[PDB]
Design a protein around this motif. Sequence first.
Motif, short mmCIF file in Angstrom:
data_model
loop_
_atom_site.label_atom_id
_atom_site.label_comp_id
_atom_site.label_asym_id
_atom_site.label_seq_id
_atom_site.Cartn_x
_atom_site.Cartn_y
_atom_site.Cartn_z
N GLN A 62 41.83 32.13 29.31
CA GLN A 62 40.64 32.46 30.12
C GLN A 62 39.44 31.69 29.58
OE1 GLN A 62 40.55 36.59 31.61
NE2 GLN A 62 38.62 36.55 30.46
N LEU A 63 38.75 30.98 30.46
CA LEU A 63 37.56 30.19 30.10
C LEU A 63 36.29 31.03 30.28
CD1 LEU A 63 38.41 26.73 31.68
CD2 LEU A 63 38.93 27.57 29.44
N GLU A 64 35.21 30.58 29.65
CA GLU A 64 33.92 31.32 29.59
C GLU A 64 32.89 30.55 30.41
OE1 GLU A 64 34.64 34.91 27.69
OE2 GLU A 64 32.73 34.14 28.58
N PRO A 65 32.28 31.17 31.44
CA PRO A 65 31.18 30.55 32.17
C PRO A 65 30.11 30.08 31.17
CG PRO A 65 31.90 32.54 33.30
CD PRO A 65 32.65 32.48 31.99
N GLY A 66 29.45 28.96 31.44
CA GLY A 66 28.52 28.39 30.45
C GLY A 66 29.16 27.30 29.60
N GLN A 67 30.46 27.37 29.30
CA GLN A 67 31.18 26.24 28.67
C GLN A 67 31.28 25.07 29.67
OE1 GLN A 67 31.59 25.63 25.71
NE2 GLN A 67 31.67 27.57 24.63
N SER A 68 31.18 23.83 29.18
CA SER A 68 31.21 22.61 30.04
C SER A 68 32.57 22.59 30.79
CB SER A 68 31.00 21.36 29.19
OG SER A 68 31.19 20.17 29.96
N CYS A 75 33.52 24.45 48.52
CA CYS A 75 33.72 25.90 48.85
C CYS A 75 32.62 26.80 48.28
CB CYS A 75 34.96 26.53 48.23
SG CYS A 75 36.50 25.61 48.44
N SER A 76 31.35 26.64 48.64
CA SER A 76 30.27 27.52 48.11
C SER A 76 30.20 28.86 48.87
CB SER A 76 28.94 26.82 48.12
OG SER A 76 28.65 26.37 49.43
N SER A 77 31.08 29.09 49.86
CA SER A 77 31.29 30.39 50.56
C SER A 77 32.09 31.38 49.69
CB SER A 77 31.97 30.19 51.89
OG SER A 77 33.31 29.75 51.69
N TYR A 78 33.12 30.92 48.96
CA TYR A 78 34.00 31.75 48.10
C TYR A 78 33.33 31.97 46.75
CZ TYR A 78 37.66 31.26 51.58
OH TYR A 78 38.38 31.39 52.73
N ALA A 79 33.72 32.99 45.98
CA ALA A 79 33.22 33.18 44.60
C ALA A 79 34.40 33.21 43.65
CB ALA A 79 32.41 34.45 44.48
N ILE A 80 34.21 32.59 42.49
CA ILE A 80 35.27 32.48 41.45
C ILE A 80 35.33 33.79 40.67
CG2 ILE A 80 35.87 31.31 39.31
CD1 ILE A 80 34.89 28.69 40.73
N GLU A 81 36.53 34.34 40.52
CA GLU A 81 36.78 35.53 39.67
C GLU A 81 36.97 35.03 38.25
OE1 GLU A 81 39.48 38.75 40.83
OE2 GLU A 81 40.65 38.39 38.98
N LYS A 82 37.92 34.12 38.04
CA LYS A 82 38.16 33.54 36.70
C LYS A 82 38.82 32.17 36.81
CE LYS A 82 42.54 36.01 36.29
NZ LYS A 82 43.26 36.94 35.40
N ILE A 83 38.73 31.42 35.73
CA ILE A 83 39.40 30.11 35.58
C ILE A 83 40.16 30.13 34.26
CG2 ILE A 83 39.16 27.62 35.56
CD1 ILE A 83 36.35 28.00 36.77
N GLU A 84 41.48 29.94 34.37
CA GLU A 84 42.44 29.94 33.25
C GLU A 84 42.93 28.51 33.00
OE1 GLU A 84 44.56 33.18 35.38
OE2 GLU A 84 45.05 33.82 33.32
N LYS A 105 42.65 34.94 46.04
CA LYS A 105 43.22 33.63 46.43
C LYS A 105 43.42 32.81 45.17
CE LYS A 105 41.14 31.75 50.11
NZ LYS A 105 42.38 31.53 50.90
N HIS A 106 44.42 31.92 45.17
CA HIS A 106 44.79 31.13 43.97
C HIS A 106 44.86 29.64 44.29
CE1 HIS A 106 46.06 35.26 43.64
NE2 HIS A 106 45.77 35.15 42.32
N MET A 107 44.21 28.85 43.45
CA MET A 107 44.16 27.38 43.58
C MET A 107 44.31 26.78 42.19
SD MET A 107 41.01 25.19 45.02
CE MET A 107 40.89 26.24 46.47
N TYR A 108 45.27 25.87 42.04
CA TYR A 108 45.43 25.04 40.83
C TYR A 108 44.53 23.82 40.93
CZ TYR A 108 49.46 27.91 39.60
OH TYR A 108 50.30 28.93 39.26
N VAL A 109 44.06 23.43 39.75
CA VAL A 109 43.44 22.11 39.56
C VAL A 109 44.46 21.31 38.77
CG1 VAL A 109 41.50 20.82 38.66
CG2 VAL A 109 41.13 23.15 39.50
N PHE A 160 40.00 33.39 43.02
CA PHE A 160 38.74 33.47 43.77
C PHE A 160 38.92 34.42 44.95
CE2 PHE A 160 39.49 30.44 47.30
CZ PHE A 160 40.70 29.92 46.89
N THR A 161 37.79 34.86 45.50
CA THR A 161 37.73 35.89 46.55
C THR A 161 36.65 35.46 47.51
OG1 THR A 161 36.06 37.39 45.61
CG2 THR A 161 38.34 37.78 44.91
#
Lengths: 198, 196
Positions: A18-24, A37-46, A133-137, A196-197
Motif C-alpha cells: 500500500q502506497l502513501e498519498p504525498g509520496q512521489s 478520469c477526474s470523475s472517479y476517486a482513488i481508494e488506494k494504490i498498491e 473498480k480495479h485498474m492495473y498500471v 477506485f470508486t
Amino acid sequence: NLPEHWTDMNHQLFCMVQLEPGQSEYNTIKDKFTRTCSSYAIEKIERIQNAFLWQSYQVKKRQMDIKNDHKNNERLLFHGTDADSVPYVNQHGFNRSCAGKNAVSYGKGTYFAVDASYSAKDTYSKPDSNGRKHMYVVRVLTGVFTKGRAGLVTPPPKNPHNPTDLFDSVTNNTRSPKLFVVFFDNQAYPEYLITFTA
Amino acid sequence: NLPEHWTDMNHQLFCMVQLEPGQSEYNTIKDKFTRTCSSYAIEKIERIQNAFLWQSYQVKKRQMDIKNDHKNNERLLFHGTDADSVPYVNQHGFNRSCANAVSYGKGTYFAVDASYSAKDTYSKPDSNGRKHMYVVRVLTGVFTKGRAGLVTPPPKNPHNPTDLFDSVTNNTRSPKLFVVFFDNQAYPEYLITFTA
Ligand SMILES: NC(=O)c1ccc(Oc2ccc3c(=O)[nH][nH]c(=O)c3c2)cc1
Ligand SMILES: NC(=O)c1ccc(Oc2ccc3c(=O)[nH][nH]c(=O)c3c2)cc1
C-alpha cells in the motif's frame, strides 16, 4: 535482481504494498490516472511485488532491447479488469487465453489502454458488489508495432517473405496509438493496482 | 548460461546445428526415437540453439525448482508437427494459441513415446514424405489429470485457487501425454527429420 525500492519480502515471492498519498510514487500514478478520469476517486494504490513475474518480464525486456537495438520498447499503460481476475493477475500476470473479445478487436491478445478513461469503463473495470473498480498500471513491451487485425493470434510479420520475424505488438493506429495488444506471456508486468470508486 | 555441448555461434543468438551421425549426442537422441520408431528412417537430427528461448526456459525451470522445492520438474518428450510450423517453433517455441483434439485442455501437447508423435495427424508428411518431430525439454513439474476446456492447469486445492499444478496428463499413474499452458515451459531441443 529485485528492484532496490521494493520492501523486504524476506524469502517471500509476492507482496502487495500500500502506497502513501504525498509520496512521489503515489502522486505520479494518481496524476497519470486523473489526467483522463477526474470523475472517479482513488481508494488506494498498491505496488505489486511479484519476484517471478518481474524476472521473466526483465528477461523479455533485455531480449527485446538487444533485438530492436533502440531501447524504446516499454510503455506504461492501463488495464481495467473485474475483481474475480485480480488474484490471478497479481500472481500470474496477463493470460491471453482468459482475454475477452474487445468491442474493436485488433487481435486475440491482452489489451492495454494509453488513457485511464478507457480502462475506467464498467465493461473493463467491472464494479464489484461494493462498487470498487480495479485498474492495473502495467509496464508493457510494445516494442515495434503496427496496426492489428481481428484474426491475429500472434503479431504479424514485418516482412511476408520472412514469416517468423514478428512485430512486438499491435495497436489501433500507428500515428495516434490508443491501445496495444500483446500476444505472449511475460510481455507485461502488472506494477500497480488502483482501487477506485465513483 | 549456454549449454557446454552447444557449438560456437559466431556471436549469433539462433542456429540449427546438424548432428554428426555416430557420435555420442546423435546416438543418444536416435536411441530415444528408435525405442518406439525402429521402422522409420532418420534423414537428420538438428540441435536447436536458440539463446532467448533457452534463457526464458531456464528462468522458468529455476522458478519451478524453487516453488516445488526439488529438481525433478523436467521430462524429455516428443512433439510432431507439420513442416510449415517448424520455422515458428525453432524461433519462438510452442504456442497454445496456434493449436487436432484438445481433450485434456487448450495447451501444447507432448508425447512420452515418439511412436504417438510419428502418426501423420501430428508429424504431417510434406510433398516428399518428410515428417518432423521435436525432442523437447518440458517442465511437467507436479501434474494432475486434465479435462476438456482447461485454459490453465487446475488448482492444487480449491482453498487456494492461484496455486496451480504445473501441467496435466491423460493418466497420473502411467502418463502418455503432457499438456502445458504457458510460454517457455517447453524448450525444443532437437528436430528429427524422418520418413516411413
Ligand atoms: N482492458 C482495458 O482496460 C482496456 C480499455 C480500453 C481499451 O481500448 C481503447 C480503445 C479506444 C481508446 C481511445 O479511443 N482513446 N484512448 C484509449 O486509451 C483507448 C483505449 C483497451 C483495453
Ligand atoms: N503433437 C504430438 O506429437 C502429440 C502426439 C500425441 C499426443 O498424445 C498421445 C496420446 C496417446 C498416447 C498413447 O496412448 N501412448 N503413448 C503416447 O506417447 C501417447 C501420446 C500428444 C502430442
